Design a protein around this ligand. Structure first.
Ligand SMILES: O=C(O)C1=C[C@H](O)[C@H](O)[C@H](O[C@H]2[C@H](O)[C@H](O)[C@H](O[C@H]3[C@H](O)[C@H](O)[C@H](O[C@H]4[C@H](O)[C@H](O)[C@H](O)O[C@@H]4C(=O)O)O[C@@H]3C(=O)O)O[C@H]2C(=O)O)O1
Length: 353
């Protein structure tokens, strides 16, 4: 105790969440199929782009849900989070472009945007009890994934990169210093904090942050029912199946990131249950939503289970690694999700001969 990875260290702050050089090499030389071609991001002059300015002062974000933790969405929510969504989108896009092209211009463009946010002490001042707490985990991790691919890049302002790295480290330490509630301590939100702590711990060579991140994956494995369902996600009523899938996203990224540091989280299990059990459940429940009735009576919102949904990004990473079948036939168009490092089609998908 208190968990099996409590002595783990960051070996290589530049290792990112994929083998950057190997993948770029593959993208520039390999035998690409139609879907990988479709995933190639389009080059543009990012030096002339206007990027979102950070909120000055207090980060104030309305609750997502009108009431409780499900049902109709709050009308005031989306107009406010849009700024953050633009920030994430741009960040992930520039990260993906750097991987694909190796052009330092994309790295410099990312750093200038992040420097601007860092200067303003963004993602630091907020009520931990508000929606803002969640927004921080999503945006900070998104920026960190993109930055992680360019930690080895020599043609940038190294002082700027450092300044930006330090900033994200402060963000993550502050954000993860709050235990959360009865649910948020231990549900998908916990796992999102885990991915944030893991990737930021890597790039800032912060072993303590890294370990805390790995710990969240461990916590999750002990919260899987025998059918493979996550305990806390099965209480979300009509969003139950949605949140079961949603949990897969950061858990996968923690695993992928840790694998670059020589740790095999996928192999970790608790009572013979592992992340594979959870995958099987998602696939099985999408086919047969009577599986969910055991937990929730409302018909399930299945908006996430459509080709092209960001929500499926975790499948690209897992399938590349384990070679399982696309049972649902969702892996047709490319997938892009800033919050899990952009396009996992671009970064992980291997055409099968
Ligand atoms: O990927 C797409 O192609 C896509 C297309 C759509 O046009 C639209 O852009 C869509 O937006 C997605 C996307 O993931 C976006 O970030 C947002 O994600 C949601 C999640 O789906 C959850 O609802 C999440 O959960 C928490 C909730 O925020 C609140 O904190 C509550 O108390 O706890 C929840 C929990 O995590 O336990 O919130 C994010 C969000 O960013 O608000 O919306 C989805 C979408 O389907 O609309 O993607």
């Amino acid at each position: 105790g208190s968990h099996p990875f409590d002595q783990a260290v960051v070996k290589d702050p530049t290792a990112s969440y994929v083998d950057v050089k190997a993948r770029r090499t593959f993208l520039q030389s390999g035998q690409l199929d139609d879907r990988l071609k479709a995933a190639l991001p389009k080059e543009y002059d990012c030096t002339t782009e206007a990027t979102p300015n950070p909120q000055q002062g207090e980060m104030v974000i309305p609750r997502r849900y009108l009431s409780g933790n499900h049902g109709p969405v709050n009308p005031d929510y989306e107009p406010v989070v849009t700024l953050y969504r633009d920030f994430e989108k741009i960040s992930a896009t520039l990260g993906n472009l750097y991987v694909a092209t190796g052009k330092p211009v994309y790295a410099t463009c990312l750093l200038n945007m992040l420097d601007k946010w860092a200067k303003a002490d963004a993602l630091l001042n907020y009520d931990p009890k508000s929606q803002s707490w969640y927004q921080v985990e999503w945006s900070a991790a998104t920026a960190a994934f993109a930055l992680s691919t360019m930690m080895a890049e020599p043609n940038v302002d190294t002082a700027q990169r450092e300044r930006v790295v330090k900033w994200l480290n402060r963000v993550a330490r502050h954000q993860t210093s709050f235990p959360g509630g009865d649910t948020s301590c231990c549900n998908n939100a916990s796992y999102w904090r885990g991915q944030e702590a893991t990737i930021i711990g890597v790039i800032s060579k912060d072993d303590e942050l890294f370990r805390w991140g790995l710990g969240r994956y461990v916590q999750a494995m002990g919260l899987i029912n025998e059918d493979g369902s996550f305990v806390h996600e099965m209480t979300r009523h009509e969003q139950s199946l949605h949140y079961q899938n949603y949990a897969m996203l950061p858990l996968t990224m923690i695993a992928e990131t840790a694998s670059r540091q020589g740790i095999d989280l996928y192999a970790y299990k608790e009572n013979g249950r592992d992340i594979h059990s959870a995958r099987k459940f998602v696939f099985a429940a999408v086919k047969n939503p009577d599986l969910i009735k055991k937990y929730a009576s409302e018909p399930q919102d299945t908006r996430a289970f459509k080709p092209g949904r960001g929500d499926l990004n975790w499948i690209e990473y897992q399938r590349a690694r384990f070679g399982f079948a696309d049972e649902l036939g969702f892996m047709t168009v490319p997938i892009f999700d800033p919050r899990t490092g952009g396009s996992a089609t671009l970064l992980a998908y291997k055409p099968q001969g």
